[PDB]
Write an enzyme that holds these catalytic residues in place. Structure first.
Site, PDB file in Angstrom:
ATOM      1  N   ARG A   1       0.894  -0.973   0.007  1.00 52.37           N
ATOM      2  CA  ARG A   1      -0.122   0.081   0.176  1.00 52.37           C
ATOM      3  C   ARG A   1       0.844   1.338   0.143  1.00 52.37           C
ATOM      4  O   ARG A   1       1.688   1.555   0.879  1.00 52.37           O
ATOM      5  CB  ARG A   1      -0.921   0.199   1.375  1.00 52.37           C
ATOM      6  CG  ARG A   1      -1.832  -1.204   1.323  1.00 52.37           C
ATOM      7  CD  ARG A   1      -2.628  -1.430   0.439  1.00 52.37           C
ATOM      8  NE  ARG A   1      -3.498  -0.347   0.018  1.00 52.37           N
ATOM      9  CZ  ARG A   1      -4.421  -0.198  -1.207  1.00 52.37           C
ATOM     10  NH1 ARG A   1      -4.538  -1.246  -2.150  1.00 52.37           N
ATOM     11  NH2 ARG A   1      -4.998   0.740  -1.252  1.00 52.37           N
ATOM     12  N   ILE A   2       0.618   2.063  -1.008  1.00 53.63           N
ATOM     13  CA  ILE A   2       1.044   3.479  -0.858  1.00 53.63           C
ATOM     14  C   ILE A   2       0.503   4.320   0.388  1.00 53.63           C
ATOM     15  O   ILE A   2      -0.585   4.171   0.523  1.00 53.63           O
ATOM     16  CB  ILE A   2       0.656   4.239  -2.285  1.00 53.63           C
ATOM     17  CG1 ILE A   2       1.510   3.548  -3.472  1.00 53.63           C
ATOM     18  CG2 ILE A   2       1.148   5.647  -2.254  1.00 53.63           C
ATOM     19  CD1 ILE A   2       2.649   2.856  -3.127  1.00 53.63           C
ATOM     20  N   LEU A   3       1.312   4.812   1.091  1.00 55.85           N
ATOM     21  CA  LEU A   3       0.855   5.650   2.441  1.00 55.85           C
ATOM     22  C   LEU A   3       0.829   7.035   2.057  1.00 55.85           C
ATOM     23  O   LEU A   3       1.743   7.683   1.270  1.00 55.85           O
ATOM     24  CB  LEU A   3       1.950   5.446   3.368  1.00 55.85           C
ATOM     25  CG  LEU A   3       2.409   3.830   3.853  1.00 55.85           C
ATOM     26  CD1 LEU A   3       3.455   3.699   4.347  1.00 55.85           C
ATOM     27  CD2 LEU A   3       1.287   3.322   4.810  1.00 55.85           C
TER      28      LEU A   3
ATOM     29  N   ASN B   1      12.041   1.125   3.284  1.00 56.68           N
ATOM     30  CA  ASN B   1      11.593   0.007   2.385  1.00 56.68           C
ATOM     31  C   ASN B   1      12.744  -0.680   1.600  1.00 56.68           C
ATOM     32  O   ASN B   1      13.787  -0.216   1.211  1.00 56.68           O
ATOM     33  CB  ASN B   1      10.614   0.990   1.439  1.00 56.68           C
ATOM     34  CG  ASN B   1       9.954  -0.046   0.429  1.00 56.68           C
ATOM     35  OD1 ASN B   1       9.300  -0.909   0.796  1.00 56.68           O
ATOM     36  ND2 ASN B   1      10.325   0.081  -0.956  1.00 56.68           N
TER      37      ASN B   1
ATOM     38  N   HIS C   1      13.198  -2.335  -1.964  1.00 61.61           N
ATOM     39  CA  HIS C   1      12.444  -2.321  -3.438  1.00 61.61           C
ATOM     40  C   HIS C   1      13.529  -3.194  -4.339  1.00 61.61           C
ATOM     41  O   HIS C   1      14.588  -3.035  -4.282  1.00 61.61           O
ATOM     42  CB  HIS C   1      12.576  -1.032  -3.798  1.00 61.61           C
ATOM     43  CG  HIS C   1      12.315  -0.840  -5.420  1.00 61.61           C
ATOM     44  ND1 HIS C   1      10.792  -0.889  -5.735  1.00 61.61           N
ATOM     45  CD2 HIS C   1      12.887  -0.773  -6.456  1.00 61.61           C
ATOM     46  CE1 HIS C   1      10.721  -0.833  -6.876  1.00 61.61           C
ATOM     47  NE2 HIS C   1      12.037  -0.911  -7.583  1.00 61.61           N
TER      48      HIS C   1
ATOM     49  N   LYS D   1      15.900 -11.494  -4.177  1.00 56.43           N
ATOM     50  CA  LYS D   1      15.511 -11.852  -2.602  1.00 56.43           C
ATOM     51  C   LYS D   1      16.688 -12.166  -1.996  1.00 56.43           C
ATOM     52  O   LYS D   1      16.746 -11.888  -0.807  1.00 56.43           O
ATOM     53  CB  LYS D   1      14.545 -12.942  -2.603  1.00 56.43           C
ATOM     54  CG  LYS D   1      12.972 -12.519  -3.044  1.00 56.43           C
ATOM     55  CD  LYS D   1      12.169 -13.690  -2.523  1.00 56.43           C
ATOM     56  CE  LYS D   1      10.621 -13.149  -2.769  1.00 56.43           C
ATOM     57  NZ  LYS D   1      10.413 -11.667  -2.533  1.00 56.43           N
TER      58      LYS D   1
END
EC number: 6.3.4.13
Length: 200
Positions: free
Chosen positions: A90-92, A106, A108, A170
């Site tokens: 979700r974009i905050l 974050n 990415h 990852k």
């Protein structure tokens, strides 16, 4: 530093953070794990580690600000110093991001500024890079554009799919995300006054 990790999925980044924060000379501890989706494996991983969880279903709120406020209530409830976004989808909103400025990281799966957005592997494969990577950055309002803490390059192999490239990236994520949390949680790296990354 007391840490929250927000997730939306499998939680492999969560897992590497749990493991590292529990090594002896850690400056961080994970005190809560919040998901915006129910029944994701990242929640089981948290509980199996003995870490409290909360599901805050974003679909139960009329807009972003209100969903973000519910998240912030849990963060204050748990006295959180640092928030880690680990596969959180979700974009905050501006006010949440502003409040947590310099205290939210974050992970990415590209070498920013290349391949912003949630489908970075798909973009990398389509573009034909032979080198991609991952990035830990401070979260700014501008998506995938906050200040860069660490990055690690990862090769693209001929015949990679999203899945094979994703797994390779990852492996690198699981290294830099914990190292970056430790940088912020200790003295070492902060978002300075001039909005730039500062190594104390």
């Amino acid at each position: 530093a007391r840490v929250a990790v927000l997730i939306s999925g499998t939680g492999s980044n969560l897992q590497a953070l749990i493991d590292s924060t529990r090594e002896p000379n850690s400056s961080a501890q994970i005190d809560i794990v919040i998901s915006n989706k129910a029944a994701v494996a990242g929640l089981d991983k948290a509980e199996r580690a003995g870490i409290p969880t909360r599901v805050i279903n974003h679909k139960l709120y009329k807009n972003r600000v209100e969903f973000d406020s519910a998240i912030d209530l849990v963060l204050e409830e748990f006295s959180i110093d640092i928030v880690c976004l680990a596969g959180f989808m979700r974009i905050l909103s501006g006010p949440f991001v502003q409040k947590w400025n310099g205290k939210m990281l974050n992970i990415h799966p590209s070498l920013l500024p290349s391949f912003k957005g949630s489908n970075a592997h798909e973009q990398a494969l389509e573009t034909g890079v032979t080198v991609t990577g991952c990035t830990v950055h401070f979260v700014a309002e501008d998506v995938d554009a906050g200040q860069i803490i660490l990055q690690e390059a990862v090769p693209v192999k001929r015949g990679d799919t999203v899945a094979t490239l994703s797994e390779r990236v990852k492996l690198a994520e699981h290294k830099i995300f914990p190292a970056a949390l430790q940088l912020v949680a200790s003295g070492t790296v902060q978002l300075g006054e001039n909005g730039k990354i500062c190594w104390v």
